[PDB]
């Protein structure tokens, strides 16, 4: 745990420095859930990937 | 506001009519105020009558609604009008009529504003108004109870008015009997019992009792209301001094003994401390109610219920006096006589031993300090009476082996283990009495006193045996005999017991140093009854201090006896004092001072005031030192006052120890040592916290003997909850070892606390109320202030002898078993309005068997819905019976 949003920022950043560059996600689902349980550590972690994603989208 | 309503004829105006007395009315306000004064009475008399009817009607309409906005300002504006000049002056009929709704208007203000000022003011107006109206208040209340609807607010208001009457500001006896209190008691139990308690209105309730018994039975709880009147009465010492209350308790006691609820009567006779009162509580029950029922029985049952100190029957003022009245009471001469004899209360205790089992594992091991240590331990494991029988029978190990003072100590503690035997313990003491040195025989005598109380009740008395013994020329045997005498009678007034004390210790010249205990024994007899008034104890104490104050033990005991002999009364001390003055010394001046304090003592505010002008924080040589600790305890007072005052006492007990330490530095160690016993006397509302807190610290501070004192209270309710507490204490003691001398004190502490399961709990309370007296706690109490406690003093200090009887269930219609009996439990409680604290007789059924407890047992009551009955004896099981009174002369509640 904790590493999952940290990954997203760096990979997404690589694109920005060497711009224009395309970030292509194969299947955005298993992460793009509109529902999280958010009570077990497992659910919390998926919820943290989505949270980073949205922030990062404006960042590009 | 909304002017007009009833002063307007149209159909429409009826809605404004309710509202209108809040602002102003056209003529209706004026009718009592303006129109009555300005015009002359007779011209005006026709109009006022018509309008009178309408104000009555408005009252009824306002009750119809549930609103306070419409109720309160409306009745208030109307009052002022009445006050002015329709009070008594209009005519003979018209003031009675105006005065009837006036009462109604008054209640809301009286009740709502609580203050002292408001309180006195309302009484002034109510009393004058009551006299003139002449009994209309009684009809008014009854109509209001019936009504069609009323407010919840009003429930509190109507009772409050009854308080204006009780003051007698303008009354003196006219309408001092009921404002229709009877329905009023039934609905709500709150303010009304206070009013009743002060008035002496309580007489009328006996006449009323016949009607009330139905409501008390299954329908309501009228029973709670009378028990409350009793709480207010005892509380009245705290509210206003002992001399003021004393007159009051006498008049209250006569109405209660006449009433069917006997425990309330029993509490008040026990407080006054008189011979006459006791025989009357016994006889009165039988006479007032002629039906056999419980009524004949209540006299004996109340004496058994009374638990304050000592053995069977406990007070023992009552045991001698109840004979002669015995013959008159006549359930049967042969049976009533046998039930009253302490031979029947002994047998039941035998059964409880079986349940408790052996706890004994203690030292009985020979040679050294351990031999002395062993003797105190054997009793301490099985405190009161348990299965310690094996050890006591065995003479050879513990009793005989000791040397010097140790022999007296060994023998003295023996009686306390043998406690509550008819005979067979007496056989055992007699066998020692004959053998060995003087120390064995004398020690045997305290112990003798204990076992022989078992056959008594004015046929073969305890007195009879002790009378021969006292005569002995040797100092030691005679001392032990008087000490033994004091132990048996406890606090009685009897011709013989007083007579044996009259010549004994007629000198301050004595061989032993324990001669002083004679004075204490004498002191004990005086309290818990009408005083002894013995010459020997008074005259000698002043001479003793002048020859010697070098012996810290000797010097202390004689003035302690003087201070106790005087307690019990103020009046009596005067006769003895008068004598003392003949011999004048500087010592005597101090003796005189003690009499002021003694007479004033037990007051709830006088005693407190006295302690600024103290004899602590002073030494005149060391004269002042001896009684100064005694004053500070206030221990009698603490037990004497109500269950309500106990909550307060938990701080008081601590407060008194603090006071000694501040005043006197040397006195500080002593004060802590007294503390363990102080709590034992006190029997406070919550028992758990105080001794445990003390128990750990008492190892560190010099004199480990404090810890030994602590252990006596410390076991509290015998192990179910206490299992953690008794194990931890014992460990703290045993854990630290530094010397054989230290080990022995700590060893006494470990073993006392460590009591096997389901055993007789520490008590000097009644077991309905924490009301009582102590003149047996005194025997350790006195000896716990002797500087570096000797082997000889330890011996005096060892006895318990005050703890519970095993029967806490039906005495009833002649049962007297330990064999199970059903009880009811209420999961839903309503009551905190009963002093004793027994919840509703509406019952939910549960299994049989109530056995000894100290604290709790309050929700435990006896079924009264199984065939519908009400408890005479308010049930908790501490030393409260599960017994009921019903019309039938046999219990409809059959043994489980």
């Amino acid at each position: 745990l904790g590493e999952g949003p940290r990954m997203v920022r760096d990979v997404f950043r690589l694109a920005k420095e060497n711009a224009p560059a395309i970030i292509f996600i194969d299947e955005i689902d298993a992460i793009a859930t509109k529902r999280f349980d958010a009570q077990t550590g497992a659910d919390r972690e998926v919820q943290r990937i989505l949270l980073e994603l949205l922030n990062q989208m404006d960042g590009f | 506001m909304e002017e007009g309503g009833r002063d307007k004829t149209p159909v429409q105006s009826q809605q404004p009519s309710a509202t209108a007395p809040s602002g102003a009315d056209e003529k209706s306000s004026g009718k009592e105020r303006r129109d009555a004064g300005e015009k002359d009475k007779e011209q005006e008399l026709s109009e006022e009558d018509k309008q009178l009817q309408d104000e009555l009607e408005m009252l009824v309409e306002r009750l119809g609604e549930k609103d306070t906005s419409l109720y309160r300002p409306a009745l208030e504006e109307l009052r002022r009008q009445i006050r002015s000049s329709t009070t008594s002056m209009t005519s003979v009929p018209k003031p009675l009529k105006f005065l009837r709704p006036h009462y109604g208007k008054l209640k809301e203000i009286y009740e709502n504003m609580a203050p002292g000022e408001n309180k006195c003011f309302a009484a002034d107006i109510i009393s004058v108004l009551a006299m003139t109206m002449s009994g209309e208040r009684e009809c008014l209340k009854y109509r209001l109870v019936g009504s069609q609807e009323e407010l919840a607010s009003w429930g509190h208001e109507y009772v409050r008015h009854l308080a204006g009457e009780v003051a007698k500001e303008w009354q003196e006896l006219d309408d001092a009997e009921k404002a229709q209190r009877e329905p009023l008691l039934t609905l709500v139990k709150e303010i009304v019992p206070y009013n009743m308690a002060h008035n002496a209105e309580h007489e009328a309730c006996d006449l009323l009792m016949e009607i009330e018994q139905v409501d008390m039975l299954e329908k309501d709880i009228d029973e709670n209301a009378y028990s409350k009147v009793c709480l207010y009465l005892t509380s009245c010492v705290n509210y206003v001094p002992e001399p003021e209350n004393s007159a009051l308790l006498r008049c209250a006691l006569g109405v209660f003994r006449k009433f069917s609820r006997f425990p309330e009567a029993l509490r008040l006779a026990l407080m006054l401390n008189d011979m006459e009162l006791v025989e009357d509580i016994f006889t009165s029950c039988k006479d007032v109610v002629v039906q056999k029922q419980m009524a004949f029985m209540l006299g004996r049952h109340g004496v058994f219920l009374e638990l304050s100190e000592d053995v069977e029957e406990y007070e023992d003022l009552t045991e001698i006096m109840s004979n002669v009245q015995l013959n008159s009471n006549f359930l049967a001469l042969a049976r009533e006589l046998d039930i009253m004899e302490p031979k029947v209360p002994d047998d039941i205790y035998k059964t409880h031993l079986e349940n408790n089992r052996f706890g004994g594992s203690g030292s009985q091991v020979d040679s050294a300090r351990m031999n002395l240590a062993s003797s105190f331990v054997n009793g301490f494991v099985n405190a009161a009476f348990g299965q310690d029988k094996l050890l006591t029978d065995d003479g050879n190990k513990w009793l005989y082996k000791n040397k010097d003072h140790g022999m007296l100590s060994a023998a003295a503690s023996l009686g306390m283990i043998l406690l509550w035997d008819v005979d067979g313990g007496l056989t055992q003491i007699d066998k020692y009495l004959y053998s060995s040195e003087d120390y064995i025989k004398s020690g045997a005598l305290l112990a003798c006193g204990i076992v022989n109380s078992g056959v008594r009740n004015e046929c073969d008395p305890a007195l009879a045996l002790l009378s021969d013994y006292v005569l002995h020329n040797s100092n030691t045997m005679r001392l032990g005999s008087i000490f033994g005498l004091g132990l048996a009678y406890a606090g009685s007034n009897r011709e013989d017991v007083l007579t044996l004390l009259l010549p004994v210790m007629g000198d301050s010249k004595s061989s032993m140093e324990v001669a002083g205990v004679t004075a204490l024994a004498c002191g004990m007899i005086a309290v818990g009854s009408c005083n002894g008034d013995v010459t020997s104890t008074i005259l000698q104490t002043i001479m003793e201090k002048s020859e010697t104050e070098l012996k810290d033990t000797y010097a202390r005991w004689l003035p302690l006896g003087l201070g106790l002999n005087h307690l019990g009364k103020g009046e009596a001390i005067e006769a003895i004092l008068a004598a003392l003055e003949v011999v004048s010394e500087p010592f005597r001046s101090f003796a005189n001072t003690l009499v002021d304090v003694c007479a004033y003592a037990g007051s709830g505010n006088v005693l407190k005031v006295q302690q600024l002008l103290h004899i602590c924080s002073e030494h005149f040589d060391s004269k002042e030192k001896e009684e100064d600790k005694d004053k500070k305890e206030k221990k009698d007072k603490d037990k004497k006052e109500a269950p309500a005052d106990m909550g307060a006492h938990q701080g008081v007990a601590v407060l008194g120890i603090a006071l000694i330490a501040m005043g006197e530095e040397i006195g500080a160690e002593m004060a802590l040592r007294t503390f363990g016993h102080l709590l034992r006397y006190g029997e406070p509302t919550l028992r758990r916290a105080v001794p445990l807190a003390l128990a750990l610290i008492s190892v560190s501070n010099p004199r480990l003997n404090i810890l030994d004192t602590l252990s006596k209270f410390s076991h509290d309710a015998d192990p179910e909850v206490s299992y953690n507490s008794i194990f931890a204490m014992g460990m703290v003691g045993s854990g630290t070892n530094n010397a054989r001398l230290a080990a022995m004190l700590r060893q006494l502490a470990q073993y006392h606390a460590k009591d096997p399961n389901n055993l007789f709990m520490v008590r000097l309370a009644q077991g309905l109320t924490h009301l009582g007296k102590g003149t047996l706690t005194l025997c350790p109490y006195h000896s716990d202030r002797q500087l570096m406690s000797q082997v000889a003093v330890a011996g005096l200090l060892t006895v318990l002898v005050s703890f519970l009887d095993v029967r806490n269930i039906i005495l009833g219609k002649s049962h007297y078993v330990l064999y199970g009996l059903v009880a009811a439990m209420q999961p839903r409680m309503l009551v905190t309005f009963d002093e004793e604290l027994r919840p509703l007789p509406v019952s939910v059924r549960v299994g049989q068997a109530v056995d000894v407890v100290g604290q709790a047992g309050k929700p435990k009551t006896i079924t009264g819905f199984q065939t519908h009955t009400t408890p005479v004896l308010l049930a908790h099981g501490e030393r409260a019976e599960l017994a009921t009174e019903e019309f039938l002369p046999v219990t409809p509640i059959l043994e489980g």
Binding site: - | K66, Y194, D220, S700, L830
Partner: protein, 165 residues
């Protein structure tokens, strides 16, 4: 009535004055509270130290142990520390634990949740009583049920019914 007020007051005067009197005076004179009283204050304060992990008291066990679940992701079956009482830890309240070795130093916090905050709603309404006209009967019915036993429960529970609700 007035006399009662004096009795109630009687318990309370003694409670403040006694606590004040005993703490200062008894450390000063002999060895009663003395070394022991300092010892409790000091030991708890040192163990607690910096930091303390917060936990919640799930349950109390009768053998001087308790089930605390700590806010660090680990549950503990703690041992009680010398001079702290097991039986002053409410099941409603959360307890504070020393975070080096898990023992209950004490309760400085009872803690608070957003879950509490839903139930508790404070009302101070624009329209209230006497801002409603008509349908007068309907208000009186409500009150006999709700207001009258709530204010004075004593008769209603006493008569034998459960209070009308």
């Amino acid at each position: 009535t007035q006399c009662r007020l004096k009795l109630l007051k009687l318990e309370r005067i003694k409670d403040y004055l006694l606590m004040e009197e005993e703490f200062i005076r008894n450390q000063e004179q002999m060895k009663p509270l003395e070394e022991k009283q300092e010892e409790e204050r000091s030991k708890v304060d040192d163990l607690r130290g910096t930091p303390m992990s917060v936990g919640t008291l799930e349950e109390i066990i009768d053998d001087n142990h308790a089930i605390v679940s700590t806010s660090v992701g680990s549950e503990h079956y703690v041992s009680i520390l010398s001079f702290v009482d097991k039986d002053l830890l409410e099941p409603g309240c959360s307890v504070l634990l020393n975070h080096k070795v898990h023992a209950v130093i004490g309760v400085l916090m009872d803690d608070t949740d957003p879950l509490v905050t839903v139930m508790k709603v404070e009302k101070a309404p624009q329209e209230t009583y006497a801002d409603i006209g008509g349908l007068d009967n309907q208000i009186q019915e409500i009150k006999e049920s709700v207001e009258l036993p709530l204010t004075h429960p004593e008769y209603y529970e006493e008569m034998g019914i459960k209070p009308p609700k």
